[PDB]
């Protein structure tokens, strides 16, 4: 059982889901609200046993209203309590290369089709548009975002802000201004 204000709390993944975040500690997930009180925790099975046990990253894709699950090589997409039919597939279709098993994080920008998926200490941009791989990456996490570290372990887009989180730290970095506006701790999400 993960500790919502253990002020140690790194965590494993985040998305958002039809403007309700989720939050993946292990095989749980803590489920907020917008409003300021209260924040769930359920067993990750409880919603979709056919998933792994721990999840590796995780993005929402607006326009399908589509939840990817990363874990390994291997990616599921996700809508309601269901998994389209065709998952888990590889993260090979995605066009990542092969010295690549893991994916650390994942956000995908709606102001530009573009996918952010980190691997170990580089980047990836997806287009989630056309299906592509904008060719001027792997760039590092220290070239492109500088500031945060040189590892990302999960990251989410509210609205102007880019999150990044660096073990138990958390960054509302400016997509726009190419800087840290503020710093905190991974827990403050779930208010403590
Ligand atoms: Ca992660
Ligand atoms: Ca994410
Ligand atoms: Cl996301
Ligand atoms: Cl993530």
């Given at each position: 059982?993960?500790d ?12 958002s ?8 500690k ?13 924040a ?7 919603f979709?046993?056919?998933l ?14 589509l ?38 994080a ?13 691997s ?8 989630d ?10 760039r590092?996490?220290?070239?492109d ?9 999960a990251?989410?887009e ?25 710093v905190?701790?991974a ?6």
């Amino acid at each position: 059982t993960p500790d919502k204000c253990d002020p140690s709390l790194s965590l494993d993944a985040i998305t958002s889901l039809r403007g309700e975040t989720m939050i993946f500690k292990d095989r749980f997930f803590w489920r907020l609200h917008p409003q300021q009180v209260d924040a769930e925790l359920f067993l990750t099975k409880s919603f979709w046993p056919e998933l792994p046990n721990r999840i590796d990253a995780a993005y929402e894709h607006p326009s399908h209203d589509l939840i990817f699950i990363f874990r390994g090589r291997k990616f599921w997409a996700l809508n309601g309590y269901d998994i389209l039919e065709g998952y888990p597939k590889k993260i090979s279709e995605l066009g990542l290369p092969k010295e690549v098993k893991k994916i650390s994080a994942a956000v995908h920008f709606e102001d530009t089709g573009k996918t952010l998926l980190f691997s170990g200490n580089q980047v990836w941009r997806y287009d989630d548009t056309n299906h592509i791989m904008d060719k001027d990456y792997p760039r590092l996490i220290e070239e492109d975002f500088p500031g945060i570290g040189d590892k990302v372990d999960a990251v989410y887009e509210k609205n102007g802000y880019i999150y990044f989180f660096n073990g138990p730290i958390q960054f509302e970095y400016s997509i726009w201004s190419n800087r840290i506006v503020r710093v905190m701790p991974a827990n403050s999400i779930l208010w403590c």
